[PDB]
Design a protein around this ligand. Structure first.
Ligand SMILES: O=C(O)CCC(=O)C(=O)O
Ligand SMILES: [Fe+3]
Lengths: 18, 428
């Protein structure tokens, strides 16, 4: 899921290391 | 913490020497020091753990994913050695999971946490960590089952309470989630003073009509989670001008605004054509922001990525917009048609970030029944005119007309963001 209009997800970003 | 088994106690002198090098910042020399101990003592868990920690520090010094991948394997090697003490085993695998999450190996982190839960079935904190692992991949069902097990043995664990309440609210069990979110925050346990729980507790209270909702927005603001009671975005760049309503001149994006208003009828007509001939391109709103009604969006750009198949349906509008990277390159916004029918009420809510401004172009606006509130001011749309507000402020929408209402939504970067920030901020 994505945080498009609100903050419904536990996290809104993705981790990609450094 | 007991980190030395029987054999490691006999070589404690060699082990402490290498660790002092790692503590003195001489990481490269401590790497070779622990590598030499692993060669001379291939079954030493402390020597293996020292090699992993040094690989961990070296990965930061060089910001290297490849080096961190090696440290992740070395942490696992510690677990495969014989006669590993329980404190060393827990520490190596927990750090391995944490670094797997940092790299984005969320599936790998989940398996590491599952192994920890099997090894130490009584440590509830490891269960709480396994729950977070399920939440990071979006598996709210398995996360729910985990926190139910934790609350069965530790009924007053605040960390498990807020996470259970978050899952309940995510499942639209609004009235049920409130006691778990409130009591979890009030527990003060580590991990419960988090903006995400103040945000959803206050929103759950708003949806059931509880007046105590704004008392929690106050406490969230006072503890540093919200810029204000009204502006509750959680992914913020500090210092950006905070204001509910903007004028085009204030944004500096006058050329975009003029282009939208001058060419508004062509944007309308392509949206109407999609409604008539390809209505399947309009997708229902899916973030549980409606109390009731019908509300759908047809998205052309998202996270700064053009939707190719969508632009086949609105080709002139996509051609017009591609001249303005301030919106097409906004990796924390969207460009989309938005249709709303009568009988629709959108709950008060805020967007996730203060890094965008949200523009509305009116396309088909009934003469009565449609209005939008942002903070303490309610306004209406006009056909062919742009409205600009900061959707990180609480906003609410009503549709009580006798026909549909169609607008065009164009997100832009906040004007005060530097070009370096617009390129480096993680997409949302
Ligand atoms: O009125 C609409 O279509 C969307 C309103 C809204 O919540 C927004 O623009 O973020
Ligand atoms: Fe909104």
């Amino acid at each position: 899921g994505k945080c498009k209009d609100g903050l419904g997800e536990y996290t809104c970003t993705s981790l990609e290391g450094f | 913490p007991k980190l030395l088994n029987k054999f490691d106690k006999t070589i404690k002198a060699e082990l402490d020497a290498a660790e002092k090098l790692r503590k003195r910042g001489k990481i490269e020399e401590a790497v070779n020091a622990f590598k030499e101990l692993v060669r001379k003592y291939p079954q030493s868990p402390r020597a293996r753990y020292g090699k992993a920690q040094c690989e961990d520090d070296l990965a930061e010094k060089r910001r290297s994913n490849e080096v961190l991948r090696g440290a992740i394997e070395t942490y696992q090697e510690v677990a495969s050695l014989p006669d590993v003490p329980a404190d060393l085993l827990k520490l190596s695998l927990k750090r391995r999971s944490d670094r797997q999450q940092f790299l984005g190996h969320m599936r790998g982190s989940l398996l590491t946490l599952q192994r920890l839960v099997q090894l130490f079935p009584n440590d509830t904190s490891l269960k709480n960590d396994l729950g977070v692992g399920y939440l990071l991949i979006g598996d709210n069902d398995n996360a729910k089952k985990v926190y139910e097990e934790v609350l069965s043995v530790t009924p007053n664990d605040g960390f498990a309470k807020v996470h259970y309440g978050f899952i309940l609210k995510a499942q639209n069990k609004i009235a049920e989630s409130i006691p778990y979110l409130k009591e979890g925050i009030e527990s003060g346990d580590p991990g419960t003073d988090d903006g995400r729980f103040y945000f959803h507790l206050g929103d759950a209270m708003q949806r059931v009509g509880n007046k105590e909702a704004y008392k929690w927005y106050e406490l969230g603001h006072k503890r540093g989670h919200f810029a204000s009671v009204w502006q509750r975005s959680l992914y913020n760049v500090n210092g950006l001008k905070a204001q509910p309503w903007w004028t085009p001149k204030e944004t500096g994006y006058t050329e975009l605004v003029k282009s939208l208003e001058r060419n508004w009828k062509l944007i309308r007509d392509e949206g109407l054509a999609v409604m008539d001939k390809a209505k399947g391109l309009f997708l229902p709103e899916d973030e549980n922001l409606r109390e009731k009604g019908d509300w759908s969006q047809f998205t052309l750009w998202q996270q700064g990525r053009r939707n190719e198949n969508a632009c086949k349906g609105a080709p002139k509008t996509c051609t017009l917009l591609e001249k303005f990277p301030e919106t097409t390159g906004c990796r924390r916004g969207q460009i989309k048609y938005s249709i709303m029918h009568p009988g629709t009420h959108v709950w008060p809510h805020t967007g996730p970030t203060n890094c965008r401004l949200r523009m509305h172009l009116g396309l088909v606006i009934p003469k009565e029944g449609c209005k939008i509130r942002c903070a303490n001011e309610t306004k209406t749309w006009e056909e062919g005119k742009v409205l600009i507000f900061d959707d990180s402020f609480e906003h609410e929408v009503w549709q009580d007309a006798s026909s549909f209402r169609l607008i065009f939504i164009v997100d832009v970067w906040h004007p005060e963001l530097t070009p370096q920030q617009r390129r480096s901020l993680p997409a949302i």
